[PDB]
Amino acid sequence: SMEQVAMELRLTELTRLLRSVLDQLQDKDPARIFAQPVSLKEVPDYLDHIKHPMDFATMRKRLEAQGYKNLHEFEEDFDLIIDNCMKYNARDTVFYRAAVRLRDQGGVVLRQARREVDSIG
Ligand code: NA
């Protein structure tokens, strides 16, 4: 039905939009600390602390499957990247502090993206 196509076409240009939002977000992680999942070989205990594990590659894989139905589902996985690292690392570490930064630089990017999702529709 034409309604399916109108939804498919809406999903598409949400995912085009989010690709730009993901590329921008990731460019605030130039050290690339969040760009690949934390390894359960290198960190065998991660899962007795961290319940929903996440990184930018995983966000990328899901995205190209057009797996984010709204901006809020995208925001939800980003906050996991951030929130998992803060939880598992002490405040004085490079890791935790990168997580605080990525959140702050990131909020600018997610500000405009809300304005571009509602202006486009
Ligand atoms: Na902690």
Swiss-Prot record:
Please tell me which positions the record assigns to the cross-link Glycyl lysine isopeptide (Lys-Gly) (interchain with G-Cter in SUMO2): 41
Report domain Bromo positions.
9-113
Where is this protein localized, as stated in its record? Nucleus; Chromosome
Membrane-spanning intervals of the chain: none
Q: In which tissues is it expressed?
A: Highly expressed in testis.
What's the superkingdom here?
A: Eukaryota
- Function per UniProt: Scaffold subunit of various histone acetyltransferase (HAT) complexes, such as the MOZ/MORF and HBO1 complexes, that acts as a regulator of hematopoiesis. Plays a key role in HBO1 complex by directing KAT7/HBO1 specificity towards histone H3 'Lys-14' acetylation (H3K14ac), thereby promoting erythroid differentiation.
Its assembly, as annotated, is:
Component of some HBO1 complex composed of KAT7/HBO1, MEAF6, ING4 and BRD1/BRPF2. Component of the MOZ/MORF complex composed at least of ING5, KAT6A, KAT6B, MEAF6 and one of BRPF1, BRD1/BRPF2 and BRPF3. Interacts (via PHD-type zinc finger domain) with unmodified histone H3. Interacts (via PWWP domain) with dimethylated and trimethylated 'Lys-79' on histone H3.
Recorded protein name is Bromodomain-containing protein 1
The UniProt gene name for this protein comes to BRD1
Shown chain mapped onto the complete sequence: 555 to 674 of 1058
